[PDB]
């Protein structure tokens, strides 16, 4: 029958690893680097685009940073198409929670359900896993500012600062070096960009190869604002910290 | 060899190896014999044990008042098929008030087995059956193999070394076929037929199994002291 | 039907009549309206004869499986809740049951649960159930004390069913009596109203409404 052509996507190696998860992670390691850094007064998301052509429409574009609800955003490393499938699921899940409880979904709860979906693709159904890792950046009134990551295994963990995709080894070493707990947002913005600048496989970091977002309490009094940076706004913040 | 992975694959000479391997479990099975006259039909089966502390596996199953069978090979497969027969005989009674023709029982088993020889994921039945019965056209004996082939006979035998009995019955034909109105003589002939298939063993009282059906005898099974009469 | 069960100083009394009716036709005078589920558990029947009988013997099978799986006798609370959760699934289908689940466990002490086919489940010390419940209540309530001797309790239960058997046209036949203690249930006999009424009238001097 058809058994002949079945790759068996959800089995263990003799060492007790999940082949497809490992190979998906290998795929993600060549993706544009994305960084999350958490401050006391906000969060930064920064990500490098997979190497641009001059003719790409860069302002009406989105490849790395997506809005989940008003209090939560994600940074993507991996297959974009795979990520959108999961993003719409997560967006719907947020709305179900709001509809049910009349309260915005706590960040971890959203992160857990997405990670639980991924986990399922590694244990049953014989389908390939999603080739995606997320950095979740969000706020809720239980824990305040939070950073999480999830990967194709459906394992998730929380961070003060983290990177995903390409060159996370170098990037993680650099964040570890310069990160400190009392940090403000504007310091974290600088740290994020300086880290990409040194780990990039490109010659030099320009506005047109980046996506950028903040999540601050920097609206008006005890409420939270997501800012997805326009190209011109990145060009400015790139000058403001002297990388160009 | 490369073509024996499942039943849904023909070999280059047009063979079905899984069906042939199913046929092989029958060959490892303890011997059993069928034979009939015009008034009765008899099953004799040699029962096999695990060791001297164990029971002797039953090889004969009643299907209706007028029908029943003996098995050689995988016993659970006989249980499935005999249970199907019980239902089919039953359905014929409740719906048509009609005792199921032994010939139809034959055709129904053939078609049930065949389905498992043409579809992926299933497997052929691993058991051979000898069906006897008495119906509106007299005494009958059938031979079922899990290839789906069913055959009506005056007599036959299946299992290991069944070729001894099948030869004996082939010569004896003109005698046993005309043992009418005498149950015990037909059984004696059956017990002798099976004896042509024994090696290093002979028929004991908790080793032999006989069944008879015919004109005015419901299908009944004899075991234990009830077969001592025949040793 | 009339059935009752009450808690007291010395455990639980359970008493029931034995009549079944189809309209005004007396179908039987010898129905066993108490079911012995296990040596520490009793169930009483009122409502549909089949409904009660079927689902209460089904209940016994479920209690047996609990103790095989859990190596422990089922609690009265859990046994009663199996029945009540069962009938609640059938709510609206027209099942008709008024039952009491009566028993002792070490963790609970002596316990009675009233369970009916609307899905009502109540723990309590005294219940009377059936077409004759009000008659039974009248006698039972006006003589009930927590401190009744086992002897008095048994009689009061028996006398309360008699009261209902007499006045309620749809109760009668005979009284069946049980006592439930820490050691399990004890049967205290079948008592035909045929002879019990006259015996009680004579000895007690009650039932003066009746031509002696």
């Amino acid at each position: 029958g058809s058994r002949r052509y079945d790759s068996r996507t959800t089995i263990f190696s003799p060492e007790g690893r999940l082949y497809q998860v490992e190979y998906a992670l290998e795929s993600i390691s060549h993706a544009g680097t994305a960084i999350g850094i958490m401050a006391s007064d906000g969060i930064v998301l920064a990500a490098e685009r997979k190497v641009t052509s001059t003719l790409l429409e860069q302002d009406t574009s989105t490849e790395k940073l997506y809005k989940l609800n008003d209090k939560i955003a994600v940074a993507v490393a991996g297959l974009t198409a795979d990520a959108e499938i999961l993003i719409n699921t997560a967006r719907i899940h947020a709305q179900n929670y709001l509809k049910t409880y009349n309260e915005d979904i706590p960040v971890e709860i959203l992160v857990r359900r997405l990670s639980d979906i991924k986990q399922g693709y590694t244990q049953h159904g014989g389908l390939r896993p999603f080739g995606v890792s997320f950095i979740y950046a969000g706020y809720d009134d239980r824990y305040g500012y939070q950073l999480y990551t999830s990967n194709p295994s459906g394992n998730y963990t929380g961070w003060k600062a983290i990177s995903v995709g390409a060159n996370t080894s170098a990037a993680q070493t650099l964040l570890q070096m310069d990160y400190k707990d009392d940090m403000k947002v504007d310091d974290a913005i600088e740290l994020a960009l300086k880290t990409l600048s040194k780990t990039t496989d490109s010659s030099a970091l320009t506005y047109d190869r980046l996506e950028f977002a903040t999540i601050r309490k920097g609206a008006n009094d005890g409420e939270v604002y997501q800012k997805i940076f326009k190209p011109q706004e990145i060009k400015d913040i790139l000058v403001k910290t002297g990388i160009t | 060899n490369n073509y024996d992975g499942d039943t849904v694959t023909f070999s280059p000479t047009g063979r079905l190896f899984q069906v042939e391997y199913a046929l092989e479990a029958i060959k490892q099975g303890s011997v059993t014999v069928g034979l009939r006259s015009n008034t009765h039909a008899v099953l004799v089966a040699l029962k096999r044990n695990a060791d001297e502390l164990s029971s002797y596996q039953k090889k004969i199953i009643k299907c209706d008042e007028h029908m029943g069978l003996s098995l050689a090979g995988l016993a659970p497969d006989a249980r499935v098929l005999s249970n199907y027969l019980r239902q089919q005989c039953n359905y014929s009674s409740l719906v048509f008030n009609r005792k199921l023709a032994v010939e139809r029982a034959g055709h129904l088993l053939c078609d049930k087995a065949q389905k498992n020889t043409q579809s992926y994921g299933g497997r052929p039945y691993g058991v051979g059956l000898l069906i006897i019965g008495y119906d509106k056209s007299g005494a009958h004996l059938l031979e079922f193999q899990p290839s789906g082939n069913v055959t009506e006979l005056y007599g036959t035998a299946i299992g290991a070394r069944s070729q001894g009995a099948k030869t004996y019955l082939e010569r004896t034909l003109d005698t046993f076929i005309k043992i009418d109105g005498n149950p015990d003589e037909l059984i004696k002939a059956g017990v002798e037929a099976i004896s042509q298939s024994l090696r290093d063993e002979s028929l004991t009282v908790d080793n032999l199994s006989i069944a008879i059906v015919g004109k005015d005898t419901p299908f009944t099974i004899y075991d234990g002291e009830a077969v001592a009469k025949y040793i | 039907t009339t059935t009752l069960a009450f808690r007291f100083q010395g455990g639980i009394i359970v008493a029931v009549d034995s009549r079944a009716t189809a309209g005004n036709w007396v179908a039987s005078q010898t129905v066993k309206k108490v079911i012995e589920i296990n040596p520490f558990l009793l169930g009483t029947m009122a409502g549909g004869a089949a409904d009660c009988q079927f689902w209460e013997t089904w209940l016994g099978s479920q209690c047996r499986l609990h103790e095989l799986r859990e190596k422990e006798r089922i609690s009265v609370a859990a046994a009663s809740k199996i029945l009540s959760n069962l009938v609640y699934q059938y709510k609206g289908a027209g099942l008709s049951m008024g039952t009491m689940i009566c028993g002792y466990t070490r963790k609970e002490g002596p316990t009675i649960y009233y369970v009916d086919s609307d899905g009502t489940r109540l723990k309590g010390d005294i219940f009377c159930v059936g077409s004759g419940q009000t008659f039974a209540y009248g006698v039972l309530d006006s003589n009930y004390k927590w401190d009744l001797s086992v002897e008095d309790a048994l009689y009061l239960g028996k006398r309360s069913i008699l009261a209902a058997a007499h006045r309620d046209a749809y109760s009668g036949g005979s009284v069946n009596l049980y006592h439930v203690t820490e050691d399990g249930w004890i049967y205290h006999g079948n008592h035909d109203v045929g002879e019990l009424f006259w015996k009680v009238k004579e000895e007690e001097g009650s039932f003066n409404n009746v031509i002696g």
Partner: protein, 235 residues
């Protein structure tokens, strides 16, 4: 790879044959049938001394008149036991009587070949099923993952089985008392067990018509162990 329901060229089901190997790796279980009862004894085989051995449950009640011992992949037996208990209690509900031991065993055995591409593989555990009923008296059955079951006067399963079966062949006779049979199960277990038999790493049970299926406490078994050494020493 190749189908889970495939026949070998010898005409045997690969998966069934392989499950029989898993059963040989199992801890030893022995049962003896007498006219006074049926004994069931097993080797607990604690994998480490810290593990609390009374929590090892390889003898199991099915109904008051039926008991069960297991050997092999013992986690596979949970659903078989569950089915057995349901089948027994259901039968009593439908028929207001005790279910026959053979009928029970046949019911459990019907589960066995319901695997394919129903469950994904055969069971990796063999069962000794022992009980009493009014028709055929005391009975012992060996239920395999092939769907086959055999009645036995005595039977051993698990790693020590071929040694123990040869021993049971010699010792069993049609007039064993229950007490003789208890000792014998203890004796044969001590022979084939790796570590030294005591009341903590072996366990005994019986089913009699009068008191049904009982698992013996460690105090009672310890005394039958002591009684067994004094019998052997004394000749």
């Amino acid at each position: 790879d190749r189908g889970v329901s495939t026949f070998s060229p010898e005409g045997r089901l690969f998966q069934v044959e392989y499950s029989l190997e898993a059963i040989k790796l199992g801890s030893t279980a022995i049962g003896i049938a007498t006219k006074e009862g049926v004994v069931l004894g097993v080797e607990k085989r604690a994998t480490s001394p810290l593990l609390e051995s009374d929590s090892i449950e390889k003898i199991v009640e099915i109904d008051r008149h039926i008991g069960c011992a297991m050997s092999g992949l013992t986690a596979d037996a949970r659903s078989m036991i569950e089915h057995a208990r349901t089948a027994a209690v259901t039968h009593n509900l439908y028929y207001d009587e005790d279910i026959n031991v053979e009928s029970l065993t046949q019911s459990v055995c019907d589960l066995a070949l319901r695997f394919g591409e129903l469950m994904s593989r055969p069971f990796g555990v063999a069962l000794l099923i022992a009980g009493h009923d009014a028709d055929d008296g005391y009975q012992l059955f060996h239920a395999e993952p092939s769907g086959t079951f055999y009645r036995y006067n005595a039977k051993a399963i698990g790693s020590g089985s071929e040694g123990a079966q040869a021993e049971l062949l010699n010792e069993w006779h049609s007039s064993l008392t229950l007490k003789e049979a208890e000792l014998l199960v203890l004796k044969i277990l001590k022979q084939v067990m790796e570590e030294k038999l005591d009341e903590n790493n072996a366990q005994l049970s019986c089913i009699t018509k009068q008191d049904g299926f009982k698992i013996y406490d460690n105090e009672k078994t310890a005394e039958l162990i002591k009684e067994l050494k004094e019998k052997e020493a004394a000749e």
